[PDB]
């Protein structure tokens, strides 16, 4: 990407301004040196202290400047070098629209965020969907992630049960009503999942306790991500969690990363931060 | 319908806030074609129209509620406290609800049953 | 030519600033002497205001190079996020501008409607 | 011979052991005697509770009472570890929640002894309470009395303006570790330095100059940040607050009202303004430097600075037609692609000066670094009023706006050049 | 993700009393004790065939640094009818404890009548390719054995990309047995 | 400017921050964040206050005019009655449909 | 690179014309490039108390001098009315425990009162080193309550 | 809608009468199985109820109390108030309670008047409100406080008669009250 190069250059602008500011500070607080007050020795300590501090500011700034001096780094350009659109007021309008669009983007993003966090609805009063559309959204979230082999299968018909697997760790089962996740069974990578025919046992257990606790936490996640009014986003938000459960068996916990508090690895990925702190350590 | 005015205006304010939320939402999704989609602009416009409607609505309901239809109001303090037709409609409602719950129970039993069987051998 | 020019100024800027501080010390010593009498210096002065102005100048040139870099970079990046046919390109440009303006003007209309 | 240890994991160094031995002569009833314990594989103490006023209500209750009362102990101990003098655990009013009301806050340098006395006479109480789903978030509601300023939110109206500081720990340190009071003291320090600045402002508020008073009124102050509008009509807003992670102030500019530009014209000077306001923390001086340098900058931003690919003989090189580079407070410099660099000083009530920045101020023979001088600029800037350029010429703050606002050429192409762009170009 | 290692006598106490010490520690941790286990091996000519109690319907035959096929219990009979052995057998035998989703076996390796040493086997039940989970196994054994040490053996299986069945377990077993016969 | 004028003005600000008319020059995310924060907070706060006003009026109306609130109740109840028998009738139609279908599949 | 100016400035900090030297060398250039330039804490704790502990200042004494005396009388419907507790605050307080005034002239008669006194003196002795008036009054409430047993 | 021969499942969500969208904690997922009912709580807990019925009665009642005390916080956020908030579990060891326990919260207004909500199962909900010392004539003004600046601190506590006040459900009643102590735009 080029965002990192952009950010480097931005910090570099800030740093060069800081350097000029520091030089000016030095010489300006030097222009009126030993101010007057309160002592004879106090004057000396204060003045020498602030002068040393300003010089250290200069040095720090020059260090940051050489630092960013290490990590150095289309068709629009052709638009300028065309002696027809140059005479007309164009290419000012174009970059104008580009900037206004970027501004609308960031502006509306933050606005919508702050508004979603603080909603007033407090009311609702004052659904079958196309199964093909269910398949569409499931496939969309399947493509959306690198390693989540989502495999929709519909025994019992309009149920649309799933089976997610992710890499040697934690293959799960999802039985969704209709884009409404209802249950979840988290089994290990070596579980019998299909009963005797390819039934995709909607109903078994996990023989190992770790995955049993993960199943409990997964049902909690289901309950927590609810957010009515068009649950298209619900499933994406859930698959983000389940994606986080990769690197489950090898990661510490946030508090006292023993890796095993009572024989159980960290099993509670937070609904926002998404890292750690196994259940005993959270509740 | 006075308290009706109060409640409806209250809900209109929530409608204001939620409409603004979705308006910013639609704005965030916008794309600046690179496409000719143009349905975006349609939803934006006809969305912005409802906001305009609700504002005049709020002015109207505010006016009608602060109209103060002969009310010598006491300040909230001392209000914190430290008709048969209502009863009839409530009784009819409770009865109809009970019948609905019998129906819901019957359907629940049928669904449990049909599930037991098919899931057993289908 | 941002990278080479920045790498070309930073050492030059450091050299200029070192000269600056040294001339500051030179003039301060000279002047506090001549105030306390006690001595003089027959040698030339090495005027200081010139040195500070030269340093500000070099800082300014670096500011120019780096701002140009960031602006051209963001320009090209935003051009990327909205593009992949030269006259066809001009056409999609005109379309883009029109769409942006229509969004802006609809917002202006709803705001003016109050 | 029969034990059941209850480990309360919110704070996993305390246990609620019981015992369940027997009752004599009744072979079916059972006894229960509960003991609070601490562990640091070691062991510290045990204290038998005695309150005897299927579900074991009494002991669900004791484990509860042990849950939320115990973080208050941690905070009290770590609060006495520093010199803050705290009242007791203090069940507040209805026997529903504990609190700790910091009697008086420890003095925080550096604050001039006057404003320290003002703060002491300002706060009435600062009390900590436990507020969280995890029991790991404290809130300190501290009330102040003689508010110097009153913002335009109609909720500050009221004598005592309450302020709440919310703190949680990282779950790794204790529930009430030293980190919470360190943070509270840092926030007291932020409130303190801001109180200093706002008290100066409040003493000055009577007989502040009329022009300032017309343009820019106070928006909100609550106690933690100060937000001031601008004028015509309350377009923009500055936000002064103290950031005790950098030990310096931080002014963030913003746009609020309609009539102003797309962005705060002053954003070009934000870093310079920040250095200024750190050196001299005097809000009146800042409002003054914003009054001037309001319309100059509002004209200067509205100049094209967009890289054009094909200017010079080498058609491959971008050149940034204009470029605004501020020299550190109020003295910004325009710069054609690289060759010409006029510099514009802002000044007293109206005027705004225009030198030719290429000419070195201390020498008249030398051209500063790279940018050559613009022949004949003195004539032109006089029109709107050898090396004669370097003497600063003066323009009356609306000539400048006519000097930069795009305008048609004296089919003209309809390009909207600026009357300064064309000359130097 | 089984891990095997040889715990010395540390005499100290007797080899059985060493097993007693381990049993006491593992009971102290709070692990329930399940039915005994037993693994034994034979070499032919060089081919190794070995039986395990965790898999009592399948007997594994392994060539050192080669193939390792699992077979049905009726692979002993094929080796019987194939005479076209050395009585260097080895036979571990001990009790099986169960932690939370965590199984650990200790045994007194016996050749003939003379127990040559003590062998401990730990297998974190729910697992996949070891390269991701060996951290946790070390985390646990550092409490149990780490006093002496555990030393990463799954490097016998960590070179690969991603797979883990039950064979590599008996591979490790054979490696240990070859180590216990040689030195006294 | 009783209350509703305040809300209109606040909404006007919260949008018109960006739209106004003028050349844009870089957008420097931070000032956008600060502007959106202040505008949106004032908007939600004037919403706070209008809701408070309406609710206070309802409390007054309750302590004064109880005929009004009881009639509100009778209105809501009858509306729910209509919604209820509508739902049950829809379900009855569905039951008839599937009944005929099932017994037909039996006849075939 | 700062060492020259550093030792130069440190050389002449004492000279009475140091300010003139700093001004002469620098101010010309710097203007050439930049243009022209009742203890009232006890009041708080008494304010924020629980209503049951109505506390006034002693009619005897003159609270004016460094330490204000207090005459606080328990209320609260649940409790049993007892004798008042006379407080004294060492104006250096906080970090100064407010004295109690012990008197069998108060409690001697009856058993309930003497039990109150036993519980009070014990628990107060336990109270650590930093008593605030709220600590005393809370302790007293707990003592009355525990004597009601 | 999928009930297998072995084990069934249901969701139970307790909500306030009108405020639903706005307030929704206290959600569960029973797994009814042969001889045990496993409960998974939104908060993250996993309780294993026995096969009896009184147990489920009790658990659901405990959740009902907790829900009232959670709904008050959700409403205070809904708009208008800052929270000096609760303990889900403990309150302040005020009284014993036979269903597990009770949770109490305390949220202040924009300016002054703080309200407080205690509620436990089979120990009636008690909501009392605070006042500034200004508005209470009863409290005997102590001489020790001599100043005026101090009067406007939050003061005492005065219980609110629930069974009377006004409203349909408990969140509605508390909302009318919580608006009733607002800056009083009338």
Curated annotation (Swiss-Prot), chain C:
Its main location: nucleus. GO terms for cellular component: core mediator complex; mediator complex; nucleoplasm; nucleus. Widely expressed in embryo and adult. Keywords: Acetylation, Activator, Nucleus, Transcription, Transcription regulation. GO terms for molecular function: transcription coregulator activity. GO terms for biological process: positive regulation of transcription elongation by RNA polymerase II; positive regulation of transcription initiation by RNA polymerase II; regulation of transcription by RNA polymerase II; RNA polymerase II preinitiation complex assembly. Transmembrane segments: none annotated. Component of the Mediator complex, a coactivator involved in the regulated transcription of nearly all RNA polymerase II-dependent genes. Mediator functions as a bridge to convey information from gene-specific regulatory proteins to the basal RNA polymerase II transcription machinery. Mediator is recruited to promoters by direct interactions with regulatory proteins and serves as a scaffold for the assembly of a functional preinitiation complex with RNA polymerase II and the general transcription factors. Belongs to the Mediator complex subunit 29 family. This is Mediator of RNA polymerase II transcription subunit 29. The chain holds residues 55 to 185 of 200 of the full protein.
From Swiss-Prot, chain D:
It comes from Homo sapiens (Human). Belongs to the Mediator complex subunit 14 family. Component of the Mediator complex, a coactivator involved in the regulated transcription of nearly all RNA polymerase II-dependent genes. Mediator functions as a bridge to convey information from gene-specific regulatory proteins to the basal RNA polymerase II transcription machinery. Mediator is recruited to promoters by direct interactions with regulatory proteins and serves as a scaffold for the assembly of a functional preinitiation complex with RNA polymerase II and the general transcription factors. A motif (LXXLL motif 2) lies at residues 400-404. It comes from the Eukaryota. Signal peptide: none annotated. The modification Phosphoserine is found at residue 51. This is Mediator of RNA polymerase II transcription subunit 14. Residues 1-242 are annotated as: Interaction with SREBF1. The chain holds residues 535 to 1212 of 1454 of the full protein. Interacts with GATA1. Component of the Mediator complex, which is composed of MED1, MED4, MED6, MED7, MED8, MED9, MED10, MED11, MED12, MED13, MED13L, MED14, MED15, MED16, MED17, MED18, MED19, MED20, MED21, MED22, MED23, MED24, MED25, MED26, MED27, MED29, MED30, MED31, CCNC, CDK8 and CDC2L6/CDK11. The MED12, MED13, CCNC and CDK8 subunits form a distinct module termed the CDK8 module. Mediator containing the CDK8 module is less active than Mediator lacking this module in supporting transcriptional activation. It is found in: Nucleus. Ubiquitous.
UniProtKB/Swiss-Prot annotation, chain F:
It is a peripheral membrane protein. Widely expressed. Highly expressed in vascular tissues such as placenta, testis and liver. Residues 68-104 form a coiled coil. Belongs to the Mediator complex subunit 28 family. GO terms for molecular function: actin binding. GO terms for cellular component: core mediator complex; cortical actin cytoskeleton; mediator complex; membrane; nucleoplasm; nucleus. Keywords: Actin-binding, Activator, Coiled coil, Cytoplasm, Membrane, Nucleus, Transcription, Transcription regulation. Induction: Up-regulated by endothelial cells when exposed to tumor conditional media. Its main location: nucleus. It is found in: Nucleus; Cytoplasm; Membrane. Component of the Mediator complex, which is composed of MED1, MED4, MED6, MED7, MED8, MED9, MED10, MED11, MED12, MED13, MED13L, MED14, MED15, MED16, MED17, MED18, MED19, MED20, MED21, MED22, MED23, MED24, MED25, MED26, MED27, MED29, MED30, MED31, CCNC, CDK8 and CDC2L6/CDK11. The MED12, MED13, CCNC and CDK8 subunits form a distinct module termed the CDK8 module. Mediator containing the CDK8 module is less active than Mediator lacking this module in supporting transcriptional activation. The keyword Magnesium does not apply. This is Mediator of RNA polymerase II transcription subunit 28.
From Swiss-Prot, chain H:
It is found in: Nucleus. Ubiquitous. It is linked to Microcephaly, postnatal progressive, with seizures and brain atrophy: A disorder characterized by postnatal progressive microcephaly and severe developmental retardation associated with cerebral and cerebellar atrophy. Infants manifest swallowing difficulties leading to failure to thrive, jitteriness, poor visual fixation, truncal arching, seizures. There is no acquisition of developmental milestones and patients suffer from marked spasticity and profound retardation. Progressive microcephaly becomes evident few months after birth. Belongs to the Mediator complex subunit 17 family. Interacts with GATA1 and PPARG. Component of the Mediator complex, which is composed of MED1, MED4, MED6, MED7, MED8, MED9, MED10, MED11, MED12, MED13, MED13L, MED14, MED15, MED16, MED17, MED18, MED19, MED20, MED21, MED22, MED23, MED24, MED25, MED26, MED27, MED29, MED30, MED31, CCNC, CDK8 and CDC2L6/CDK11. The MED12, MED13, CCNC and CDK8 subunits form a distinct module termed the CDK8 module. Mediator containing the CDK8 module is less active than Mediator lacking this module in supporting transcriptional activation. This is Mediator of RNA polymerase II transcription subunit 17. The chain holds residues 466 to 651 of 651 of the full protein.
